[PDB]
Design a protein around this ligand. Structure first.
Ligand SMILES: CC(C)c1ccc2oc3nc(N)c(C(=O)O)cc3c(=O)c2c1
Ligand SMILES: CC(C)c1ccc2oc3nc(N)c(C(=O)O)cc3c(=O)c2c1
Lengths: 599, 599
């Protein structure tokens, strides 16, 4: 092992220079050791001064003992880098929405700080971007090491040029895949990649070659497999397209403003009950409900006037100018439900039907490890989708229960109003005949039409109540019989299989670094290869045969049940508007009974 | 390494016979290898036949190659045993309620199966009780190895005798500590332990010697540090006391019935909003709401008639004979709230004030590892308490919001009723004078008292509405200003520190097994010892100075706010009952206006 006056480090604990994990001799504290005249000591001094949350801290520069080479003692990051993170199987299709926002925040704050100090980081990339655990348990990302797949079109032939690798990095972080992918690999087909980058039509954000020498699939949208909400997708997509000829690139100042406008927005969770879709609304703290409805329309196509809100079992009435920071707090588990009195197509969750790749029987430490990553990533995606499908079903079941409770309030508000006017109708109908005992035939004939008109409402209200009752045709019971429930524990069953798959993946990663295995370790490696396929086949069978099939039956049943719900609200409204119309005609003949008197 | 025809195993992977972790030569599958004429082959054959969920499966018995000794190839349990689990720091004060119920279920099913087959397991204990992960992610516990601290009073001098070690095991699992503890250790003071076990007065479930040669603390209750709900505590406590002179022991058949009666009960989560206490109600599927109210009274002292229920923002009206299996589904996050119209003392969460033990500077691999377990266990407890305190605050804030919404419904129901009778009062007051123009002075004077009596209600209703409005004295705003919130992330801050503490604990466990460390590894061990105390002191400071202090301010503010709430419901009721009384006196003079007529 080498050493310096203050530090020492084993060469085995290595993290083209080398980086080792070592300790301070006097404290034992972990530090990053960078192992490789005054032109460097100057730029080192300015870097030694840099103290920022998003910059890995450089503590000291010491001389190793055996060589006189300059070493840097740097802040150690136990978790590793964004590359490490993006190599994990649960992020194979993008970071979790919450995690993606932390990467954006910390990268943005570090860059601006760099610009503010004149440094240029020619090649930002996931391998340059280190992760540390903040004292509050949230990831904090920190830039370090300033001074192909990420290189600019001008650089690939061999500032905005920095924005390019930033763009690729964010797409990779958002989707788990590179945005520009020749068939095979970009390094493998360096020539195809340059054509893709220069010939890209403006606005496009990706180009994938699916067959060898095949065409390029352009897209202005994120892939379906991206986990970011549509709300977030709608804001991020234009930024990437407009920052990936640097003449028409956005530029930093515009980039900093547009990204700050995203980071300053809060998220409101909305579930479209008739469409069976969950939504995240990215809205500024100071925006009004008026603005909120427009953002919801963009994702739902429900005009403001048709948006009917339900929250914690009761109607939510938003005032147009009420600011979003004063809205009730929501989560994915507790969203604001939106419903509409106008028919809407039931969409549900739209996801990609992805099958397992074939498992190549040929023993290959590199291929199996490469395959293990891909097949494990698919199961992670399947597990995430299973959870969202279950959540969609759980939210559906809760929202319907509340809506039934809302209708009963409406039913009780109008039903009281009727009996409330009956007490006057049945009273004033006789008080007329009271005077008679002390043309009136024309008043009684018109009045007897109101009681007869009021009887058709009574029997119709009793028919709606009958339908809202436990045996009614709009009953709830079906929601507990179809689809899947938490007590079914389908998600835990998939995660258990994933954990078995994840252990083998990490072992294949270890098996790769050691170039050859002994006979025994070799056999064990081949045994677990068949178990991988066996676990994946069992899981996919359970996922497709049980989760998806039952989800579509619950969804198909909802679509007809939804249709019924719309019919009831329409019938109730008609009965409700007639009660106001009847109420005012009786409140009009109430006085024309009494004439002026002589006195 | 040794081997047999079908299996082989390294001696390093060892799990007084030895148990190693090995593989099947042809498949690679993990199995437990037990390494030590026809008297044994017979009992082995009956054991080879045993196929049960709660019995570790014995697959085959083979002969090792170097020795002719008989070995048993047994089902491998990757997680280890209940001892292992109970050694983890987050279970230092008992298993999670959900986990405790799984241990009970699997132990009970295996025992009965054993009895049903005639086997006797003379010494059940956490080390005998192995854990495996079920295919649904839930622990499954399985008995194995049949054929001091757990020994019966008759056995300690040197079937029911089996129930004793079962009793000690359940207490240990429930609380994290042994029920019978001489000062120092039971093994250390074998003599004190026997007096404790024979001289224990009936009904007592624990005996702890807190000082050397000191007295015995008896208890019929679980310690405060137990995590099991009071609902569960109320059922478990009598079982342990009555199964720990075997003349008056419960016996198996009674034990199996009483335990089945517990396992067959469902759990309903209840939060007493006026007491600020959460509750789990252990109730049978077929019990009625009538029975439910009695169980709630036992934990709350709220008589049935005074129990007012709120669920998902609306009143919950339970019919007395409605079975519990038809109740709405509840969780700790979404409980049924109970409120009362009668004043109740605000209790809140009652927990033990536990300080850190002192850290002994004396280097000792055994002492530090022993200390590391204890001090890490305390922080786990503090983290669990922090979470419950936060949950209590979050549930309080939600329930109050709903109650305010409930009162507004009540306020609107009576306020409509009034205006509904005004339309008749203001109508019939003039219709009287209508006839006059065509003793009556006595009718007008009594009637003008009703409008005057109705004006005092109107101004009083406007005063309650004023108080229910945003500026009202019963405002909600305070609930968002006091205590702690999820966005404060206090729990994550504690878990992060715990994870740092937990890594050192596991390292101390490793450092212990290796009897001596080299100079370098020794220094690193001493460095992390000071960090342990440093992390614990920082955490406790944050816990006491921030979490507890702010919790008591939110609680103290609630107690006065609660007092106000009770005053409003009492004033509203008075205004509400007068509206019915007024309504019927006006509905009585409405007809006495018109007399019989000649005809
Ligand atoms: C084995 C791989 C996943 C890994 C694990 C932990 C690591 O911890 C680091 N800390 C640092 N400060 C720096 C740096 O400042 O460059 C780099 C690394 C790693 O490369 C690194 C790499
Ligand atoms: C290192 C310690 C925590 C540990 C970890 C895994 C283990 O996995 C086992 N599986 C079994 N079938 C049996 C058995 O059948 O006796 C016993 C053990 C262990 O003792 C055991 C002990």
């Amino acid at each position: 092992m080498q050493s310096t006056s203050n530090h020492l480090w084993l060469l085995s604990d290595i993290l083209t220079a080398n980086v080792f994990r070592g300790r301070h001799k006097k404290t034992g504290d972990l530090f990053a050791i960078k192992v490789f005249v005054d032109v460097q000591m100057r730029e080192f001094e300015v870097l030694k001064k840099l103290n920022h949350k998003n910059i890995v801290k450089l503590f000291a520069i010491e001389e190793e003992t055996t060589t006189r080479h300059k070493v840097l003692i740097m802040e150690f990051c136990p978790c590793g880098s964004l590359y490490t993170v993006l190599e994990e199987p649960s992020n194979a299709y993008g970071l979790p929405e919450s995690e993606f926002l932390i990467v954006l925040r910390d990268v943005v704050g570090g860059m601006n700080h760099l610009r503010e100090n004149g440094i240029v980081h020619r090649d930002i990339k996931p391998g340059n971007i280190m992760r540390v655990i903040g004292e509050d348990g949230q990831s904090v990302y920190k830039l370090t090491d300033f001074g192909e797949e990420y290189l600019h079109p001008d650089m690939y032939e061999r500032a905005t040029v920095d924005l390019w690798s930033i763009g690729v990095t964010f797409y990779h972080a958002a989707t788990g895949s590179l945005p520009f992918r020749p068939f095979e690999g970009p390094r493998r087909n360096k020539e195809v990649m340059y054509k893709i980058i220069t010939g890209k039509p403006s606005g496009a954000i990706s180009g994938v070659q699916k067959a060898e020498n095949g065409p390029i699939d352009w897209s202005g949208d994120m892939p379906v497999s991206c986990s970011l909400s549509r709300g977030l997708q709608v804001l991020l997509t234009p930024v990437l397209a407009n920052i990936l000829d640097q003449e028409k690139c956005w530029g930093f100042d515009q980039f900093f403003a547009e990204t700050s406008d995203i980071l300053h927005r809060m998220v409101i969770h909305v579930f479209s009950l008739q469409q069976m879709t969950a939504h995240k609304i990215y809205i500024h703290s100071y925006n009004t409900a008026t603005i909120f409805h427009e953002l919801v329309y963009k994702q739902t196509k429900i005009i403001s006037s048709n948006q009917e809100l339900i929250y914690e079992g009761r109607r939510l009435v938003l005032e147009p100018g009420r600011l979003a920071q004063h809205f009730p707090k929501t989560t994915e588990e507790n969203p604001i439900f939106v419903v509409s009195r106008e028919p809407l197509n039931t969409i549900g969750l739209i996801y990609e039907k992805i099958s397992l790749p074939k498992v190549h029987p040929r023993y290959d430490l590199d291929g199996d490890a490469s395959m293990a990553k891909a097949i494990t990533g698919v199961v992670c995606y399947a597990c995430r989708i299973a959870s969202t499908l279950l959540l969609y079903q759980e939210l559906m079941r809760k929202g319907i229960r509340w809506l039934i409770e809302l209708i009963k309030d409406d039913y009780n508000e109008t039903v009281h109003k009727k009996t409330e006017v009956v007490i006057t109708l049945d009273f004033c109908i006789r008080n007329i005949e009271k005077t008679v005992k002390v043309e009136i035939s024309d008043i009684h004939t018109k009045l007897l039409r109101l009681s007869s008109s009021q009887g058709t409402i009574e029997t119709s209200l009793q028919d709606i109540d009958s339908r809202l009752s436990p045996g009614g045709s709009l009953a709830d019971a079906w929601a507990h019989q179809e689809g899947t429930h938490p007590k079914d524990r389908n998600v835990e069953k998939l995660q258990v299989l994933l954990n078995c798959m994840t252990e083998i993946y990490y072992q294949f990663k270890k098996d790769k670094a050691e170039r050859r295995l002994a006979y025994n370790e070799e056999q064990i490696h081949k045994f677990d290869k068949q178990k991988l396929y066996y676990h994946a086949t069992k899981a996919m069978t359970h996922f497709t045969d049980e989760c998806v099939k039952k989800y579509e039956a619950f969804l198909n049943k909802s679509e007809e049940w939804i249709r019924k719900m719309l019919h009831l609200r329409k019938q109730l409204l008609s009965l409700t508007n007639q009660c106001f119309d009847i109420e005012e005609e009786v409140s009009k003949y109430q006085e024309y009974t009494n004439e002026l008197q002589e006195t």
